[PDB]
Amino acid sequence: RSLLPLVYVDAVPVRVDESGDVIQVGLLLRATESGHMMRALVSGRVMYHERVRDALVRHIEKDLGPVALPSIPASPQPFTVAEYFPTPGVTPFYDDRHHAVSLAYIVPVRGDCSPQQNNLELTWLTPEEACSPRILAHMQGGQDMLLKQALAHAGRLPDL
Amino acid sequence: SLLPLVYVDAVPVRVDESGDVIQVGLLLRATESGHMMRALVSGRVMYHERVRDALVRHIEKDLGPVALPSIPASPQPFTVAEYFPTPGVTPFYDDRHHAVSLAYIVPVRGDCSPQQNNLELTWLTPEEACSPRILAHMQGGQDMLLKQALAHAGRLPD
Amino acid sequence: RSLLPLVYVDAVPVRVDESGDVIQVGLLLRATESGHMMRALVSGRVMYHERVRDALVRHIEKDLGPVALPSIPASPQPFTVAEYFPTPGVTPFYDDRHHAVSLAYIVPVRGDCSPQQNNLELTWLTPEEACSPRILAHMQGGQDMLLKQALAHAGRLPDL
Amino acid sequence: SLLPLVYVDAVPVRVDESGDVIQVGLLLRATESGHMMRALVSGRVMYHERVRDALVRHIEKDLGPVALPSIPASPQPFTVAEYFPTPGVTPFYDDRHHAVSLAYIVPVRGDCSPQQNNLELTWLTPEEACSPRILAHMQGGQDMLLKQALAHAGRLPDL
Ligand SMILES: [Cl-]
Ligand SMILES: [Cl-]
Ligand SMILES: [Cl-]
Ligand SMILES: [Cl-]
Ligand SMILES: [Cl-]
Ligand SMILES: [Cl-]
Ligand SMILES: [Cl-]
Ligand SMILES: [Cl-]
Ligand SMILES: [Cl-]
Ligand SMILES: [Cl-]
Ligand SMILES: [Cl-]
Ligand SMILES: [Cl-]
Ligand SMILES: [Cl-]
Ligand SMILES: [Cl-]
Ligand SMILES: [Cl-]
Ligand SMILES: [Cl-]
Ligand SMILES: [Cl-]
Ligand SMILES: [Cl-]
Ligand SMILES: [Cl-]
Ligand SMILES: [Cl-]
Ligand SMILES: [Cl-]
Ligand SMILES: [Cl-]
Ligand code: NA
């Protein structure tokens, strides 16, 4: 962690209609270390000798359950790359533990979903709702921006 | 005649659990000369129609009501294929017009069946689809488009 | 204009550092058809038998002068497609004359620029500056949003 | 050997006024055994180093200080190439380790001189680049990365 950047993945869970239009964004609500509330995207490390899309698979099931039916993007190209730095103010992304370089994807879920393990809740929000300050505020390490870049990428960032 | 046409090209695929492309589907139909051709899911975007709605419509037009396409959330296409009515100008050509086609990978998760003019829908592995035999039957440089689709899916073979 | 969608391009003109990082965006100032002032991206139709990347070149020269030295992307993949509808409220994009389907690109310009023809001025703004309310207010047909999508794509959409 | 490494790959290109790729540049190198091999610009992203900066650094590292690379404004790479330490897991492989490589097309706008580990900087049109001769000389499947790059550029050759 103090030595090299970590390969991560961020997956923005979304509900889409038939045309692929993003209908809702799914945010996880868990507690911070001190029992304060936060909101996050599906985010996690890639393992040695693990493929990225597999990590995507593994992380989705972990946060949402084995019947979430993700549509893992046919293509490896992420919509962006979020560079979480251990020092704030360098990139829009920050994580106190490590320097993490994440391939970020929008991942539609075709199945049913529930919060698991450390995930207390799973909230489906419209783009307008997801981009409420109250919501964004609850997000950490700059994931609120990554969220906004995800919406922007899907052509559904709200004007407010 | 005088305007370039907005088009989409949809590349249907069977993906596995991890979204990895295992099969692509190619529509077998006849040319006006009655010659054999393989094809992508392709056509005009209508006036006042959304691109993603046109993907839905052409998919259904070619593959059926229950193909259950996964239309990409983002309008960012994998490439742009510009069919010029003059050969050699771009990798792509169409005798009828200048068409600017927005190309997408479209996973199909349901039952798919050849409709209207299409004679059959053939699912082929990437290694299969890129065999000289099949490619040779693709028109207007759509063979190049398929390779671009595969290259973008991390599945262009050697 | 009343029968088929038109193929358009939008180019977001930017100043970058050596690291490729977007430092400023170039907004043109001009009149609306009505006399009001607006701010515009570089935007226009692709001509019959004209390649898209060539339409990009043509529109850059046309708005910014022949020595702007744009870096046309090697890749035909736009960062988005902006679908300007002749009806407001259908997409985030609106044009009162046409249905335009536009392939949008961020275009760094490497040379000196000067606002041409009906362009009154050229404004170089930092992302913060470009996303000032008043600025985005001045944009038309949802181009303020397309600008945000462009900044989002570049990883430079402002928090505030 | 407990970690996957964050990597970049750069495909250096000469584009015309319209961004059209006219030639790609291949770096010639020696194998450990001293066979001749050709290469893209690839190397690690150091801790606390931004991707775009590692991109500059490895381009400068290989093409000299005058290459004037056009690093893309967008952090979206044209693809993500996974060199597994085991062959055949993905199209790419590297016995040294597991490298998650972010691939970009990088237009070079200036003088590019071969420096250090490289012996020769070979500029080749796309049709030249995909000659089985050339590709053969590429390791870790970079021949396949080179094609994906060309394909993404609309310039993959029909042979
Ligand atoms: Cl995809
Ligand atoms: Cl994505
Ligand atoms: Cl985007
Ligand atoms: Cl049609
Ligand atoms: Cl449309
Ligand atoms: Cl669309
Ligand atoms: Cl492309
Ligand atoms: Cl796609
Ligand atoms: Cl048109
Ligand atoms: Cl125009
Ligand atoms: Cl065109
Ligand atoms: Cl110019
Ligand atoms: Cl739109
Ligand atoms: Cl609209
Ligand atoms: Cl809308
Ligand atoms: Cl772009
Ligand atoms: Cl505007
Ligand atoms: Cl030129
Ligand atoms: Cl090109
Ligand atoms: Cl890719
Ligand atoms: Cl690239
Ligand atoms: Cl490609
Ligand atoms: Na214009």
Side-chain angles (χ1 to χ4, degrees), chain B residues 77-80 148 152, chain C residues 74-78, chain D residues 151-154:
Chain B
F78 70 87
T79 192
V80 182
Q148 285 180 265
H152 199 243
Chain C
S75 179
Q77 184 183 41
Chain D
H152 196 247

Side-chain angles (χ1 to χ4, degrees), chain C residues 19-20 51 53 72 74 110 153, chain D residues 18-20 52 71 73-74 109:
Chain C
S19 71
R51 298 186 310 169
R53 68 182 56 247
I72 312 294
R110 313 284 167 162
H153 182 65
Chain D
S18 72
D20 212 304
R52 62 180 63 264
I71 310 289
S74 178
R109 313 191 302 277

Side-chain angles (χ1 to χ4, degrees), chain C residues 4-86:
Chain C
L4 313 161
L6 305 171
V7 183
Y8 263 57
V9 288
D10 284 277
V12 166
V14 311
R15 285 179 178 164
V16 300
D17 62 16
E18 197 210 9
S19 71
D21 197 355
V22 181
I23 312 299
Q24 287 180 314
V25 179
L27 301 187
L28 299 168
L29 178 89
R30 64 170 160 234
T32 59
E33 323 163 306
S34 60
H36 301 75
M37 302 303 291
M38 37 176 285
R39 289 174 168 85
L41 302 174
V42 166
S43 173
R45 193 174 69 88
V46 174
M47 309 194 319
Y48 169 79
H49 224 287
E50 160 175 67
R51 298 186 310 169
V52 175
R53 68 182 56 247
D54 289 329
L56 287 173
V57 171
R58 181 169 60 85
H59 283 289
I60 293 281
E61 202 269 342
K62 174 171 169 308
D63 272 323
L64 297 183
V67 296
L69 304 180
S71 293
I72 312 294
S75 179
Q77 184 183 41
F79 81 86
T80 194
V81 177
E83 309 176 36
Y84 301 89
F85 264 60

Side-chain angles (χ1 to χ4, degrees), chain C residues 38-40 139-140 143:
Chain C
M38 37 176 285
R39 289 174 168 85
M139 320 207 50
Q140 313 296 101
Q143 287 215 131

